[PDB]
Amino acid sequence: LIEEPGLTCCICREGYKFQPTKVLGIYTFTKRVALEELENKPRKQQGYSTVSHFNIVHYDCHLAAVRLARGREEWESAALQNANTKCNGLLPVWGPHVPESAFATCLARHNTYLQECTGQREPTYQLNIHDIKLLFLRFAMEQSFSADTGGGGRESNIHLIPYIIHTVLYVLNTTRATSREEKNLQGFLEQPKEKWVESAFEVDGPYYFTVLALHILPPEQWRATRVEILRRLLVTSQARAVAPGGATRLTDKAVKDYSAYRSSLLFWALVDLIYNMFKKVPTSNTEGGWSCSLAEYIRHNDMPIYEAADKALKTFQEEFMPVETFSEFLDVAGLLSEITDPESFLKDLLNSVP
Amino acid sequence: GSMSTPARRRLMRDFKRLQEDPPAGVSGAPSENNIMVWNAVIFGPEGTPFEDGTFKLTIEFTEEYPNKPPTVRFVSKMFHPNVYADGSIKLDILQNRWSPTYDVSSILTSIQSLLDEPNPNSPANSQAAQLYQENKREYEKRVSAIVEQSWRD
Amino acid sequence: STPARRRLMRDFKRLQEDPPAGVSGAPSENNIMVWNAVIFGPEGTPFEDGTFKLTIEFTEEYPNKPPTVRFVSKMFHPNVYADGSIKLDILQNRWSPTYDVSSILTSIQSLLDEPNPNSPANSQAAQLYQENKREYEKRVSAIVEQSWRD
Ligand SMILES: [Zn+2]
């Protein structure tokens, strides 16, 4: 009868308003890549990086279409309902009135899909955090999203973020692994400045722990850690620039061109804009910390998040990408209220690290 | 008719979509009793020799809908390079390239636009494919014969 | 009337004419697709003296697809998630259209007596059921008492 406001399966045209217990899924495409390219090891540590055109299907409607279509591959079959852009996974989303028994069954099905195309048996949430990290880096480094699929760019993958984040929040909440990563994250922040050069070439470097902080730190805790993380991201850029292979101490501590810091600054901006999308999330005191409060917000607000994602992409695409100087970055990021000396803040930071 | 199955529930959705926002030139509806059989008319678009034609066709669904495409055939007499001799339509969207996201409205527009710009390199009617590229006068003359024949029903 | 609703009427009959001991369910006064059932804790088990109330959500795909069986009273059980949903083979993978509301409610109270920690849903509960039986029945008793409020 009526149309469905929120997410709608493109096969049956129905969503939660008529099937509030049917799991919705996002067609994704994941491939086996290296976690960190600057890892000084010969054989890079392996993970996976995923992209999406953000096409929605019920998990039953996907199986019904590929089962009745015998003679062709399951994922060659799903490409027709995925705007002819090839795919190999179906990321499940957990609706408000969807039973946890149904979502956990679909997440295991998606994990098996990841085991096949990426070869990574047992896809942990740590590997999934790196998957968000690599997806963030595709935004910040202006990399291609349609290179392996055939369609979809920043517009498509900016809406994949909250649900790719959700699977990390779900594993962090059921397995009670929040406090372990909380103490593990605080160890990264408390790293002395001698380790900063060495961490810019490690797998679980400053990029990974930034994505992790997004999952376990409230917005108030982020604003306090914004500058400290910004320092570690800036030193990461200089380390990877003056010594693209490996380094333990900063030799060339002189400020370089803005093109050397642009990747880390857009990475920082993309994370901050996502925190702005979730500025309305209840802080705590609700049967869980941040990873619980955020997971329930993502669960119940599919449409508020969609508009916030397009609003965040608009700010990233129109205001952050055209930035040419580090002083202009602090203007757009809004850090001038707490970083009063932009010229000295950089050169002092590169001098503060051995 | 209950409309309990997945199909029918979708066919009702395709009905309300084709009813409250029908494309220009086409109009369809299910049978009064069996929803698995639809009747649709496709008017010949202007700028083409099919203009002023009331071409009728029937669509037959199964309970596999929308996973499997429906069998569409022209009831009115048709002379087109991409239409077989029994009303069957040699179109990829209706056969191998069928997407479960396509509805009845998207099927009628694909057939409507197929009359305007045929696909002669992949022919279903050998006689109409050769006339569309060689003698444009005889092609638009034979099509005008089925335009008058579309009035005979 | 649809095939799923007429089948749901038959489920109500066999649950009112031959109601198995320890359970009692009925549809809502307005919606036939939403049922509410009570499962009294089996005697001789840690769930004794418990009045656990459930909800059963059906769709027009019934009885070909299993319903959404969910607990409302809080439950500390290895095969029961935090939101009330149950990890049970007959409710997910091994579902058969020959089952009904009674066969489900009976298979649920049987699971309270015989859990399946091999494929668990509450890891903290499945760990206590096999390692520390004394503590497992200590938290289950707290869930029994908790099922008495509203
Ligand atoms: Zn669907």
Author numbering:
A (entry chain A): 4830 to 5183
B (entry chain C): -1 to 151
C (entry chain D): 2 to 151
Study text:
To determine the structure of this complex, we obtained crystals and collected diffraction data to 3.2 Å. A structure was solved by molecular replacement using the apo structure obtained from UBR4xtal, and a UBE2A crystal structure. As for the apo structure, the N-terminal ∼100 residues in the UBR4xtal construct were unresolved. The UBR4 molecule was equivalent to the apo structure (RMSD of 0.98 Å), except for the hemiRING loop connecting αA and αB, gaining structural order, suggestive of E2 binding having a stabilizing effect. Two UBE2A molecules are present in the asymmetric unit, where the first E2 molecule (UBE2A #1) binds the hemiRING proximal to the zinc coordinating fold, as observed with RING domains. Several X-linked intellectual disability (XLID) patient mutations within UBE2A cluster at this interface. Thus, the UBE2A #2 interaction is probably a consequence of crystallographic packing. The most notable interactions arise from UBE2A residues Arg7, Arg8, Arg11, Arg95 and Ser97. The guanidino groups of Arg7 and Arg11 hydrogen bond with the side chain of UBR4 Glu4843. UBE2A Ser97 side chain also forms an important anchor point by hydrogen bonding to the backbone carbonyl of UBR4 Ile4840, the side chain of which also makes hydrophobic contacts with UBE2A Pro98.
UBR4 is a 574 kDa E3 ligase (E3) of the N-degron pathway with roles in neurodevelopment, age-associated muscular atrophy and cancer. Here we identify and characterize a distinct E3 module within human UBR4 consisting of a ‘hemiRING’ zinc finger, a helical-rich UBR zinc-finger interacting (UZI) subdomain, and an N-terminal region that can serve as an affinity factor for the E2 conjugating enzyme (E2). Via an allosteric mechanism, the UZI subdomain modestly activates the Ub-loaded E2 (E2∼Ub).
